[PDB]
Amino acid sequence: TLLINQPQYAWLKELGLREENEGVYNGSWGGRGEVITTYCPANNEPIARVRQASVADYEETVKKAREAWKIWADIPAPKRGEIVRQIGDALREKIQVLGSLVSLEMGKILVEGVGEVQEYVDICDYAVGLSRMIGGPILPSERSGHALIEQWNPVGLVGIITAFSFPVAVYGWNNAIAMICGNVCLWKGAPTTSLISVAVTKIIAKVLEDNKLPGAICSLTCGGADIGTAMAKDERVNLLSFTGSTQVGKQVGLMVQERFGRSLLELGGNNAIIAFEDADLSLVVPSALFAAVGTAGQRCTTARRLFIHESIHDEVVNRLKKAYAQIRVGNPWDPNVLYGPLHTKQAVSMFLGAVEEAKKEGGTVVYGGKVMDRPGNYVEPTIVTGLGHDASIAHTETFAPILYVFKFKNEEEVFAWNNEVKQGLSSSIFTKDLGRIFRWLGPKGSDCGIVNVNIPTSGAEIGGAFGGEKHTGGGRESGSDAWKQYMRRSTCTINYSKDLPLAQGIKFQ
Amino acid sequence: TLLINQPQYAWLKELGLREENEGVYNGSWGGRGEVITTYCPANNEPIARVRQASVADYEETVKKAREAWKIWADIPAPKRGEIVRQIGDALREKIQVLGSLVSLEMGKILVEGVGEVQEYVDICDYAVGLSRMIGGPILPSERSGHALIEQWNPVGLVGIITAFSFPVAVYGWNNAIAMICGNVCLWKGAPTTSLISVAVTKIIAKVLEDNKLPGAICSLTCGGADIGTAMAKDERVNLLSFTGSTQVGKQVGLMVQERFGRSLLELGGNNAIIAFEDADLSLVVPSALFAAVGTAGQRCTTARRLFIHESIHDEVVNRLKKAYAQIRVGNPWDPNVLYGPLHTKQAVSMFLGAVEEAKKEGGTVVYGGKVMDRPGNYVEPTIVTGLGHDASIAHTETFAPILYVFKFKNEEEVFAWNNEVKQGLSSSIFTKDLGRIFRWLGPKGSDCGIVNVNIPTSGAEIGGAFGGEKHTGGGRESGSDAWKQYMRRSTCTINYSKDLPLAQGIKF
Amino acid sequence: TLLINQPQYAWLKELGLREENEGVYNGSWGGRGEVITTYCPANNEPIARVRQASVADYEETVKKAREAWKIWADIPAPKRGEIVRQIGDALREKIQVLGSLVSLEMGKILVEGVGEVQEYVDICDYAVGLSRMIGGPILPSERSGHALIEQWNPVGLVGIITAFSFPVAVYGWNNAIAMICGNVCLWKGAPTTSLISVAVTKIIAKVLEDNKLPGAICSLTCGGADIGTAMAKDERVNLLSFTGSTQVGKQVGLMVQERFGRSLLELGGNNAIIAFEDADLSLVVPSALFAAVGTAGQRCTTARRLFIHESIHDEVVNRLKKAYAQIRVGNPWDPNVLYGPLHTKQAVSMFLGAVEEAKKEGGTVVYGGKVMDRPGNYVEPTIVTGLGHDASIAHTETFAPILYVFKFKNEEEVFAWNNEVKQGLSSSIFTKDLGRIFRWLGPKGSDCGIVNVNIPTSGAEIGGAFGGEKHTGGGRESGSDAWKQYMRRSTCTINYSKDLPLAQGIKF
Amino acid sequence: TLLINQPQYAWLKELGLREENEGVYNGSWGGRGEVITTYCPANNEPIARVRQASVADYEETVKKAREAWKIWADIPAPKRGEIVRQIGDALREKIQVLGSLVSLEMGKILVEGVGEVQEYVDICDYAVGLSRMIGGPILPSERSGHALIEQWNPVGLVGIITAFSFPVAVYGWNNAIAMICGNVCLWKGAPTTSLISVAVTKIIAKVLEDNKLPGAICSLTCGGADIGTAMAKDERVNLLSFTGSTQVGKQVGLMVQERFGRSLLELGGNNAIIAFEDADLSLVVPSALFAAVGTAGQRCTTARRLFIHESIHDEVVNRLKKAYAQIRVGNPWDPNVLYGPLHTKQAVSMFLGAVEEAKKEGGTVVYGGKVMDRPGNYVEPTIVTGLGHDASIAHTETFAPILYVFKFKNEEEVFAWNNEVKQGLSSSIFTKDLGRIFRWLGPKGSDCGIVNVNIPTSGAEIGGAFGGEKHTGGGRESGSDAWKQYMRRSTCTINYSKDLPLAQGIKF
Ligand SMILES: [Mg+2]
Ligand SMILES: [Mg+2]
Ligand SMILES: [Mg+2]
């Protein structure tokens, strides 16, 4: 009754997937832990099974990866870049089937699944160039006959824990950068996206093996919280990049700090869009729609708070409602479908609870609010007005398509309301005012890691660094100098002079 | 009996110090906490007293600094730079007396006390140029009609906790950089260097007042573990820079992580010098001496492990012995003194405890090992041979002048022995081999934040980032792009068109 | 009869000037060339005299500068930075009197003379930080056991030729940056600002001599085109920085290219302000007046073309006329004066010819256009409407206060009209439209080196690189990575291994 | 009779070459100028014909390129990078056969022809990443309410003139970087490598056309000095990159400077290897062999001067002689041939003339000196001893495999001898001495653009900047921030505040 055994889903075998798949890769494939079945959220049918990592699997994989690092760290960074280039090409070859798997197992629509693989392809191209560039300055020493250089070297083993919402691209961001920086990687993806993790690992493994490199350079140990906690506690995991909930990520950060490791934390968002009175409303409405209902509201960068100037609030809300009602719902792989299911049945439960807590806290559901009567985890995208900006349910991240709409009047108050939540990921204003734009970008503006103008809160490109502040965890991924998080800086002074130190009254020999 | 009440120490009043000083500054001076008396470690006589911060003082001061931040962050960075330049000048004007106070209260010799103030002067002058440079790149967006810019803005309030060993310059590094980055600062120095903290704050306060700026931009709350723990748990302290022991730093790091704050940790070191067979011994011997015994072995960067190749181990030890004999010991102000007292009597007990462990773990004290029979906290600079590289006492940071000497044979093993400890601050090799030097600097080389060649472990100027790895805590101060730790990065996309192209070409 | 021999001007002696001054400094003061008298342009009275450089003075000075380079290039950059810091302080000590000299000998108002000196002080402070920063990246070699480093090194002797309009700051920009980059300098300022060049060189000479450094590090050879041309042709002048007219700059650039030297050319401007229909007119009118009449229209960055959208053209012109009428004219050192003389009587003649030519090409003088009946080189600041944007006189740089005003309708054409002239220095639009601003800053916008929004064409700050494109010569000064022009880049590969892998995997 | 019509050479048609080829590409293929036939230097047989550009072709091509720029500059840099990525893949798919054509028409051996194409692939990969990174800093303005940004924008049309010795990679370095920087390109390669220029342009033109882009973005006008001079004089050529002889480049540099254009000049080398007494001779001898005889001594980076310490001179020469006699000579496209012909018959004559001149000036031919007894342009790689370092022939660049060997004793003199020539391209020392290595890299060391240690003068990687100093012309290509030469910097201040300027007494 598995989908991978039906003729309609035969394309799954193009990714090398079968009925029961090995979920551990360290140069050899295996898995002696619990066997997990993952389900298609569009119909709740089982897709295939994955043999997860036992503790012994984890132990042997970490040892094999660090052994492989001895080889990988001796490979010049530009030649490491060549490997990442080939990974990029291998992803290009499978972009459609891999994107389809993302839609099938995770549940986002096909263009977003394909677009997510593109992000990995993109960062591969970026990292290839970066592999000729990473380093530090040679600085002028104040000492005659001395050189002063800043060196950068790999940290060693980078553990990468990822969430269900971006089950390819977040790993890819960490993988391409960590790789060209000379690290080996160990991946534990979200258990409900295990087939995606296995499929991505198969693509990378072939490139490694085809280049006669040890496969443990890009190791995989599928598992749940047990394997993730072990990574957080493991002194052999030199850097732990964690992407997920603030609640779990706070414990991961503490465990890593306890052992003086390095952590890279990419945690929750509660992202606000602010529409000022001079906003182009033909930009505001489609932008708010995509940011709120894209990926069925399950992006870290999803717009969950919509602030609209009181003069235009009612008009925007009425246009947004008319917009929501035109969204095409269906199977995420089907043509022209813009809205699919939530990732889990539990997510449907959380969705309903938040809607009820909103009405209790004084909110009015003006669109949606209910589960859809159809197979899968489909709920209606939801718009709630009338809450106070500081209502509890508005300050918590609910990973579901619920948009809280607030009125405002004053720029200073609404900037403060953007910043008042514990999260600090993304933020957008819609305005034409030149000075307001530069205030929003300045020290009294948005406190978030992503600070946008006249575009939504979601859909970043790879050239810049990606991440957030406050409870979002502080880590950065992808562009700018995010690579430095994957390496260790040393400040190096070389005395090449024959000059002796000042004897200071001591008679040396 | 207070030294400040003796005419011999009247120069103290040139720093604004009195018998009883206020240890809280936030624009106004006060202090309702416990009154601490600090003592001169060269004679154990009381210098003067400082009224420390109560909880109410700390609450009041945090609030005033954060209000002051609203004014300060609005001042353009180059103009903040001009303030820091004036701080640099104000330190210059008092470098001799402030250096003397550092020698008096902390105990290092005058040239190091003066040189420590010069480090603060130097970072001011560096930060002035930086105040015109900080920012991020403008980047080419993949989308037409979009701008992509990386912005850097202040985090807000930078708490600064410092240790006794560098009671001026570590604060200075953090203050100069944090100020030009548009933050306000709150300083809690080591209790046993409270007068130094008050004196530095008096100097900065006059500059702020003279420029009609709120003095809380550089706030001070003298106190001990109670104030420091408050800062570590205080969500209003956006960045907590902590310089101190690994044991305390670990708890601070945990408390900051628990509240999703930012920390910059500068913790312990167990720094090694490695002398290969081809080393210039005329370079090795003085380098090792001044790295081991400088500041009476009380620097985070002090050389505590000396690895000498088998072929030259005996000669280097014999030459180092003959050199230790000529270390001139006296009061830290006595002209041409090289070696003063340890900071506390507890430091002496730790010194003796370590010498005793080393002798019982199989080491030989070839020089020193004894308390000096004189007033103050004086111990003999000490060299121990015969220990194994992995002896328990050698892997511990004993903050005292004990140099553990080891033999080695091969480059691979001694590199491993450098890296085998928990700390990761400073490291040095002495060699002429070109390949070995670049291997030391590379991915299979030293694992430390500071990686030196033919200079000891205290080779560090302000142009580079200063800090260590592993249990040293990972933070960086001073130069390179260390300033980014004092700011928050934003990635900013500006759509100035009338279109909505999505990243990665996604058609919704 | 000489102003320096009068009591009202005895403050000139504070700069060490006397009746007849040596105009050559190379560690010794001298001058065997012609003795020039410089005159106060506000009253045409002689100030003092300067002995200029002969060819033999020049020859000896170049040799001594290059000899001093052997010592100076061996001084670490941060310590060269400290020298520049002290120059900054010495300038600070004399800022009021040196500014007064600038107003007296050159003719700009006092706030601008002091402002010009402040710019030199500012770049000194900037350069002190930069002296711990200059250098290049260490890059990852594609080859095992190889290091790849970008080194930067001084080019050697930097000759600096400057113009009358900024007789302190242009040299200061070049001097501070060239010095921290490890070069020696040789300055030939404008003959009509010789006393300014001497006064500045006296200040720097004192700093060098107090530091026991060879004075030829900052050499001076006062003279005219003969000395300037000798520099342009001299293989021993490794970099020639030239600030001046496009006509002379083109010949200098060719002479330097002929000998495969390096030139940094800062030439003429023909700078446009554009006011769109949505512009803040309370912002446009004062910005245009300052940019047009500041320095009596004698800045390279002076606004010389004003494009106004046809909807607001008449209103802006009328408002600008009302503001011109209130410009306060008088002695440039008088503290209430906004507008002083032109620098020379030939400048007045060129002004009159351009007004004449503007009338003959169909322009209307709506304000000014006349020489003033008073001592000194005073002309009325002038506004001309009615010329076509491509009128020949509008495309010429006349270094005088004549502002040509044009109507326009659409953004596309007025951006082209900004770009159509041969000059490429500075440019400004006034608008509120977000997209227009980013189009202005993009590849189809302004082609100038300075591209401003809602501020006039003049008054840049030192944090950015300063200079222009096209006939402005391409050079940059001051901020960003302008310092690279004063240094030579080397790409350095060091094989520290025992193998010889070849680039690109070539198996030979 | 044409090689391309013999089945032996049928692989040439895989590059799209025919008996007669169009040598103009601007979206369409043409060529109404002189038809040239290029010859295989290995056997003096004609290969195929190329129709070169007439003046009318050149005119029409410049116009279409500048029209195409209006489209190309509006394409975001990352999307321009994606085109360059596809060019890289296109070159990958043709690397063996394109390199084979380089070997056939130019004459370098197969691994070098392939490696040259690999360089182009390498710079494509680099440029793709760079397309996400080009730009400047956002800087902190000293003024409240103002932003300060450094923008970079394309210059427009980049003319690229290249030499026969690297008929692929030099163009590739310029094309990939100029393309991602938003420029269009116009290529005029060496007439004797026209088939290579056509083959490369066919590869690129397919990529542009496949991406629905105007082909004039990468235009081609094959021609001689007349087309090259037109580009040098053409105001529409915003940047002219010229690679070739100092003699021609000097005139190109002066022509471009006359019109205030931009030039990037990559001219001759006279590169020296210096082997000190402590050198590893197992590295010296193979490195000198590859550097001197690679490409039959026809690289700008070829080693022409070999300085050997007196103590090891005779042994190194003896070992070099033995190494020379072992290289396999043959047709350069045959695998495992190590030594091919010179590029022209004239080059053979100039080789003989230089050998003759070396004998006249007192040199001894210790190896080689004669033409080889085989078809094609083959000469013996040649070693000359006994000349003085200042011998006229040693200071002339002769583009043939003649290596001049000199004795030296002292470091300072031999660095001076490295620096005494007019060229400043590449340089290398062989030594183990740490201090000597950093002095070589320092201000008193090599004056060249490429400063190597324990590797030869030739065979650079792409990650750093490539070029030289002095008569080498100063340009840089490829890595580091060489891309800035293909763009114009603007310093942009944006007043976003409502603050109106100070009235200064005027009633506005
Ligand atoms: Mg969850
Ligand atoms: Mg303690
Ligand atoms: Mg030729």
Nearest CA in chain A to C438: A434
B227, B348: one domain = no
Q: What is the CATH number of the domain that holds B15?
A: 3.40.605.10
Cβ B185 vs Cβ B175: under 8 Å: yes
Query: How far, in Å, are A16, A86, A110, A201 from residue A90 at the CA level?
Result: 14, 6, 19, 11
Q: Please name the helix (run of DSSP H) or strand (run of DSSP E) that holds residue A346, with its range, or none.
A: helix A345-360
The boundaries of the domain holding residue C340 are 269-461
**Cβ neighbours of D314 (radius 10 Å):** 12
D131 CB neighbours in chain B (<8 A) are 140
Vertex C408: Cα angle to C406 and C414 (nearest 5): 95
Catalytic: which of C266, C380, C411, C477? C266
Breaks in chain A at C–N > 2.5 Å: after which residues? Answer: none
Of B252, B246, B248, B215, give the one whose Cα is nearest residue B231: B252
**Cβ neighbours of B186 (radius 10 Å):** 30
How far is the C-alpha of C15 from the C-alpha of C18, rounded, in Å? 9
Instruction: Classify the C-alpha dihedral D237-D239-D241-D245 as positive or negative.
Output: positive
Kindly write down the DSSP assignment for every residue of B386-398, as one continuous string.
Answer: S--TT-HHHHS--
Instruction: Classify the C-alpha dihedral C339-C340-C341-C343 as positive or negative.
Output: negative
The structure tokens listed for D300 are: 């700008």
Query: How far, in Å, are C452, D349, D477 from residue D371 at the CA level?
Result: 65, 9, 35
Cβ D229 vs Cβ D237: under 8 Å: no
Cβ B419 vs Cβ B429: under 8 Å: no
Q: Please name the helix (run of DSSP H) or strand (run of DSSP E) that holds residue B9, with its range, or none.
A: none
Best mutation target, B79, B128, B131, B138, to test chain D (most D CBs within 10 A): B138
Chains with ≥3 CB–CB distances under 8 Å to B:
A, C, D
Query: How far, in Å, are C270, D20, D491 from residue C453 at the CA level?
Result: 17, 55, 11
How far is the C-alpha of A373 from the C-alpha of A393, rounded, in Å? 26
Vertex C78: Cα angle to C77 and C82 (nearest 5): 115
**Cβ neighbours of D313 (radius 10 Å):** 19
Of D465, D170, D123, D303, give the one whose Cα is nearest residue C491: D465
Indicate the residue of C125, C145, C497 with minimum beta-carbon distance to B128: C125
Using CB atoms within 10 A of its CB, is residue B19 exposed (0-12), middle (13-18) or buried (19+)?
exposed
Q: Is C328 on the interface with D (CB under 8 A)?
A: yes
| Interchain pair A497, D435: CB under 8 A | yes
Long-range contacts, B395-398 (Cβ 8 Å, 24+): B395/B270, B395/B420, B395/B421, B395/B422, B396/B270, B396/B354, B397/B246, B397/B268, B397/B269, B397/B270, B397/B304, B397/B423, B398/B304, B398/B350, B398/B351, B398/B353, B398/B354
**Cβ neighbours of B16 (radius 10 Å):** 16
Torsion on CA atoms D57, D63, D65, D68, rounded to nearest 10: -140
Q: Where are the beta strands (DSSP E) in A254-323?
A: 262-266, 271-275, 303-309
CB pairs under 8 A between B and C: 63
The question of whether C300 is a catalytic residue gets the answer yes
| Interchain pair C463, B147: CB under 8 A | no
Of B303, B307, B333, B340, give the one whose Cα is nearest residue B460: B303
Q: How far is the CA of D398 from the centre of ligand 3 (A)?
A: 11
Alpha helices in A361-433 (DSSP H): 392-395, 411-419
| Interchain pair C465, D489: CB under 8 A | yes
Q: How far is the CA of D342 from the centre of ligand 3 (A)?
A: 13
Nearest CA in chain B to D182: B140
B74, B166: one domain = yes
Torsion on CA atoms C404, C407, C409, C415, rounded to nearest 10: 0
Q: Where are the beta strands (DSSP E) in C209-342?
A: 218-221, 239-243, 262-266, 271-275, 303-309
Indicate the residue of A115, A294, A453 with minimum beta-carbon distance to B495: A453
Torsion on CA atoms B195, B197, B199, B204, rounded to nearest 10: -170
The residue type at D360: K
Q: Please name the helix (run of DSSP H) or strand (run of DSSP E) that holds residue D214, with its range, or none.
A: none
Alpha helices in D26-161 (DSSP H): 55-72, 77-93, 95-105, 110-130
| Interchain pair C136, A131: CB under 8 A | no
How far is the C-alpha of A357 from the C-alpha of A361, rounded, in Å? 6
Catalytic: which of C124, C218, C300, C448? C300
C211, C223: one domain = yes
**Among candidate residues C445, C461, C477, the one where a domain is terminated:** C461
Residues of B marked as binding for (S)-2-amino-6-oxohexanoate?
301, 459-460
How far is the C-alpha of B123 from the C-alpha of A111, rounded, in Å? 52
D64, D173: one domain = yes
How far is the C-alpha of D311 from the C-alpha of D278, rounded, in Å? 10
| Sheet containing A262-266: order of strands | A29-30, A24-25, A218-221, A184-188, A157-161, A239-243, A262-266
How far is the C-alpha of A480 from the C-alpha of A477, rounded, in Å? 9
The structure tokens listed for B318 are: 């014999």
The residue type at B12: L
How close, in Å, is residue B198 to chain A by CA atoms? 30
D248, D204: one domain = yes
D365, D217: one domain = no
Q: How far is the CA of D245 from the centre of ligand 3 (A)?
A: 6
**Among candidate residues A444, A461, A478, the one where a domain is terminated:** A461
A319, A447: one domain = yes
Q: What is the CATH number of the domain that holds A330?
A: 3.40.309.10
Note which residues in 128-167 of chain D have CB less than 8 A from chain A.
128-130, 132-133, 145, 147
How far is the C-alpha of A85 from the C-alpha of A81, rounded, in Å? 6
Q: Resolution limit in angstroms? A: 1.8
| Interchain pair D494, A125: CB under 8 A | no
Chains with ≥3 CB–CB distances under 8 Å to A:
B, C, D
Which residues is B51 bridged to in the sheet? Answer: B22, B35
How far is the C-alpha of D379 from the C-alpha of D368, rounded, in Å? 8
| Sheet containing D364-367: order of strands | C138-139, C146-154, C487-495, D450-453, D426-430, D271-275, D303-309, D402-408, D382-385, D364-367
D126 CB neighbours in chain A (<8 A) are 128-129, 132
Cβ D81 vs Cβ D132: under 8 Å: yes
Q: Angle formed by the axes of helices A77-93 and A194-210, to 10°?
A: 130
| Residues in Cβ contact with A362 at an 8 Å cutoff, skipping those fewer than 6 apart | A386, A387, A388, A391
- Among the bound ligands, name the one nearest to the CA of residue A346: 1
Q: Is A451 on the interface with D (CB under 8 A)?
A: no
How far is the C-alpha of D391 from the C-alpha of C201, rounded, in Å? 43
| Interchain pair B147, C438: CB under 8 A | yes
- Among the bound ligands, name the one nearest to the CA of residue D192: 3
C39, C175: one domain = yes
Query: How far, in Å, are C492, D278, D288, D338 from residue D273 at the CA level?
Result: 14, 14, 7, 21
Phi and psi torsions of B87, nearest 5°: -60, -45
Note which residues in 359-378 of chain A have CB less than 8 A from chain D.
none
How far is the C-alpha of D270 from the C-alpha of C411, rounded, in Å? 53
Instruction: Classify the C-alpha dihedral D380-D385-D389-D390 as positive or negative.
Output: negative
Solved using:
X-ray
How far is the C-alpha of D265 from the C-alpha of D300, rounded, in Å? 13
Q: Is D335 on the interface with B (CB under 8 A)?
A: no
Of A462, A464, A458, A436, give the one whose Cα is nearest residue B148: A464
B429, B469: one domain = no
Q: Given the structure tokens 């400094």, which residue do they identify?
A: C25
Q: Given the structure tokens 């551990």, which residue do they identify?
A: A24
Cβ C453 vs Cβ C437: under 8 Å: yes
| Residues in Cβ contact with C119 at an 8 Å cutoff, skipping those fewer than 6 apart | C168, C169, C172, C173, C462
Query: How far, in Å, are A2, C25, C31, C34 from residue C21 at the CA level?
Result: 99, 11, 9, 12
Catalytic: which of D105, D266, D380, D477? D266
B485, B421: one domain = no
B126 CB neighbours in chain C (<8 A) are 128-129, 132
Calculate the CA B291 to chain-centre distance.
16
D261, D312: one domain = no
CB-side neighbour CA atoms (13 Å) of B404: 30
The structure tokens listed for D115 are: 């490696």
Best mutation target, A434, A437, A438, A483, to test chain C (most C CBs within 10 A): A434
- Among the bound ligands, name the one nearest to the CA of residue A247: 1
Indicate the number of domains in chain A: 2
Cβ D435 vs Cβ A497: under 8 Å: yes
C431, C474: one domain = no
How far is the C-alpha of B339 from the C-alpha of A249, rounded, in Å? 49
Indicate the residue of A125, A435, A462 with minimum beta-carbon distance to D496: A435
D283 CB neighbours in chain C (<8 A) are 495, 498, 500
Cβ A262 vs Cβ A485: under 8 Å: yes
b/e map B352-376, b = 16+ CB within 10 Å: eebbebbbeeebebbbbbeeeeeeb
Nearest CA in chain D to C74: D443
How close, in Å, is residue C316 to chain A by CA atoms? 23
